[PDB]
Design a protein around this ligand. Structure first.
Ligand code: K4R
Ligand code: CL
Length: 115
């Protein structure tokens, strides 16, 4: 079901290395619906190449646009298993501290602050 389940650590690492080679300016992001989520839809894909200059505030706007949400639907985004300390941080900076050992940045979204 989940990304880490579908691919070996060997496969996730080699993929990140290919994104480095072929999309050197992109952050490799895994974005997944909270497995308890009732309200929000599932995304059409799992793996996203985010321009390394966008801040977390703008990435939330992008995901809300992809899910085609309206203005009073709630959306909460976890990074590497925990709340974001700030939405103003560039994703280049968030990647360097919150990245996984396979080299992906893992995100999970839900309609409640309680995941
Ligand atoms: N970069 C980029 C994105 N392309 N499509 C998206 C959907 C949600 C969040 C980010 C992106
Ligand atoms: Cl690139």
């Amino acid at each position: 079901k989940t990304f880490k389940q579908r691919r070996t650590f060997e496969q996730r690492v080699e993929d990140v290395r290919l994104i480095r080679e072929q999309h050197p300016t992109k952050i490799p992001v895994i974005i997944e619906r909270y497995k308890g989520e009732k309200q929000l839809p599932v995304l059409d894909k799992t793996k996203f190449l985010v321009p390394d200059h966008v801040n977390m505030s703008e990435l939330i706007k992008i995901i809300r646009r992809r899910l085609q949400l309206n203005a009073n639907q709630a959306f909460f985004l976890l990074v590497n298993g925990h709340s974001m300390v700030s939405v103003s941080t560039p994703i280049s900076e968030v990647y360097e501290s919150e990245k996984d050992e396979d080299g992906f940045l893992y995100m999970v979204y839900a309609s409640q602050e309680t995941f």
